[PDB]
Amino acid sequence: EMQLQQSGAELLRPGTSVKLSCKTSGYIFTSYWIHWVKQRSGQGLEWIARIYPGTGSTYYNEKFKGKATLTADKSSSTAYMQLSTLKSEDSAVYFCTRWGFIPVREDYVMDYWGQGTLVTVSSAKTTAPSVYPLAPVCGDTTGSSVTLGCLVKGYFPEPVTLTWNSGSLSSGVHTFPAVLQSDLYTLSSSVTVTSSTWPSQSITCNVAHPASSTKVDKKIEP
Amino acid sequence: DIVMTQSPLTLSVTIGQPASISCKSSQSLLYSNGKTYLNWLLQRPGQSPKRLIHLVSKLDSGVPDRITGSGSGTDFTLKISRVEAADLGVYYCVQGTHFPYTFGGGTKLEILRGDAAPTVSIFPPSSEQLTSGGASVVCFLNNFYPKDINVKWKIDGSERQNGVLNSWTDQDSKDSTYSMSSTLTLTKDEYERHNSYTCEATHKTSTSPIVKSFNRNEC
Ligand SMILES: O=C(O)CNC(=O)CCCC(=O)NCc1ccc([N+](=O)[O-])cc1
Ligand SMILES: [Zn+2]
Ligand SMILES: [Zn+2]
Ligand SMILES: [Zn+2]
Numbered sequence: 001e002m003q004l005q006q007s008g009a010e011l012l013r014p015g016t017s018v019k020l021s022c023k024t025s026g027y028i029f030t031s032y033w034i035h036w037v038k039q040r041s042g043q044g045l046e047w048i049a050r051i052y053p054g055t056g057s058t059y060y061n062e063k064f065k066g067k068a069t070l071t072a073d074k075s076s077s078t079a080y081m082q083l084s085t086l087k088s089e090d091s092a093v094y095f096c097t098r099w100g101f102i103p104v105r106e107d108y109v110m111d112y113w114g115q116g117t118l119v120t121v122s123s124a125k126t127t128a129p130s131v132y133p134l135a136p137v138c139g140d141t142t143g144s145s146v147t148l149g150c151l152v153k154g155y156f157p158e159p160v161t162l163t164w165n166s167g168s169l170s171s172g173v174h175t176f177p178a179v180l181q182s183d184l185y186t187l188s189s190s191v192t193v194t195s196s197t198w199p200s201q202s203i204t205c206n207v208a209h210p211a212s213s214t215k216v217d218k219k220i221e222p
Numbered sequence: 223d224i225v226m227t228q229s230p231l232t233l234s235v236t237i238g239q240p241a242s243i244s245c246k247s248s249q250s251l252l253y254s255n256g257k258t259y260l261n262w263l264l265q266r267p268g269q270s271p272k273r274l275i276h277l278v279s280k281l282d283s284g285v286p287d288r289i290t291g292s293g294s295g296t297d298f299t300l301k302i303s304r305v306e307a308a309d310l311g312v313y314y315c316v317q318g319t320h321f322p323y324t325f326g327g328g329t330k331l332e333i334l335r336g337d338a339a340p341t342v343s344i345f346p347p348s349s350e351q352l353t354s355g356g357a358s359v360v361c362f363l364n365n366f367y368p369k370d371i372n373v374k375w376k377i378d379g380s381e382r383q384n385g386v387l388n389s390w391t392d393q394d395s396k397d398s399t400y401s402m403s404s405t406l407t408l409t410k411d412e413y414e415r416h417n418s419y420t421c422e423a424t425h426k427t428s429t430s431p432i433v434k435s436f437n438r439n440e441c
């Protein structure tokens with residue numbers, strides 16, 4: 001099982017630099033080109049560069065020469081990409097991928113991708129969120145089924161982690177994308193259960209914000 | 223650099239129907255060795271992109287042959303013979319003939335389904351939040367289709383435009399519907415000065431606005 005694991009989300013100050021990692025396993029690291037791709041605001045990918053870990057040979061998109069530096073550690077089967085002097089345009093998700101083109105065969109082998117690394121370039125300070133339970137009064141949806149919610153607000157930067165009953169409750173939940181406003185993000189999640197479930201048994205909203213090492217569980221009480 | 227143009231931007235197709243996506247390049251993609259390095263990728267919601275086709279019409283291993291690719295020179299087409307639920311996502315063409323490699327803008331494929339009216343829930347501020355001097359009234363409009371919906375907030379009969387934060391989910395794989403969250407935030411003091419808080423939606427499934435409200439008072 002071929003796998004590429006990338007490092008966590010990064011919050012970087014304007015003008016500084018970061019090194020992203022892409023650890024691989026399940027194949028001969030030195031025999032395949034590793035490519036790096038950039039994605040900004042959804043649909044819109046850009047090819048950055050590729051490196052052949054066996055020789056250290058690299059090719060760069062002109063646009064990124066001086067911005068990105070690719071290296072690879074054969075002893076650990078890890079590819080790295082350092083980004084220098086970060087600016088607005090550098091905020092994006094970066095993927096590493098064993099693309100699979102075999103030059104000698106002029107054909108392709110399966111492509112495997114890392115999960116992506118989100119880089120946020122900002123000078124704003126890290127802020128822990130406030131988690132608020134949403135019990136219905138009118139958000140009851142009468143009997144039969146009732147929907148509860150969880151309001152996570154005032155945190156920076158992304159991401160935040162939100163589950164219901166430690167992941168036990170996953171069906172019928174809607175977690176909305178965080179929206180930035182006044183340098184702080186707000187995110188919400190709704191969960192719909194049968195009237196026979198709540199208030200009878202407890203529904204708990206679990207939230208984790210790595211950046212500020214915050215972990216909080218809110219019990220939705222009536 | 224080669225400019226790659228994809229059309230349409232979005233296509234809504236019903237499960238079982240065919241779908242085709244067009245990709246045009248500013249330079250022929252015919253490499254000097256006679257091969258054409260045109261690839262098609264799919265990026266499913268919340269997933270990394272994945273290659274579906276290489277060399278214009280060659281399917282990658284494990285890709286369903288419901289998917290077909292064709293074209294030459296500067297015109298290429300991806301065709302899905304029968305759309306299934308798992309086909310939801312953004313499709314991208316990317317050329318590898320001319321350095322540096324360039325991608326098309328993407329085509330989002332959305333599953334066209336039967337209209338679905340929103341299930342609206344409204345929530346007054348929590349005690350915890352009021353203690354902090356703040357107050358957010360939340361409104362969830364869950365599982366509707368089409369995605370087009372307009373929501374306004376009305377306090378004591380007057381529209382409130384400031385303090386509104388909206389968020390939408392991507393089309394749901396399980397039922398092809400959309401969900402939206404709308405939060406109105408005020409100060410604790412102002413919140414306590416009004417009585418009726420209304421979340422009002424405008425949607426294709428109704429000739430009149432869809433309303434959910436609550437009146438705060440004391441007891
Ligand atoms: O450069 C030349 O002239 C000759 N062309 C070649 O050798 C072909 C190179 C192989 C290929 O398919 N590249 C295109 C490509 C690579 C990576 C990628 N990604 O997203 O990771 C997206 C697209
Ligand atoms: Zn051949
Ligand atoms: Zn092939
Ligand atoms: Zn060329």
Ligand SMILES: [Zn+2]
Pocket residue numbers: 319320321
């Ligand atoms: Zn060239």
Ligand SMILES: [Zn+2]
Pocket residue numbers: none
């Ligand atoms: Zn040429």
Ligand SMILES: [Zn+2]
Pocket residue numbers: 377378380
């Ligand atoms: Zn008034």
Ligand SMILES: [Zn+2]
Pocket residue numbers: 378
């Ligand atoms: Zn009045």
Ligand SMILES: [Zn+2]
Pocket residue numbers: 377378415416417
């Ligand atoms: Zn009023």
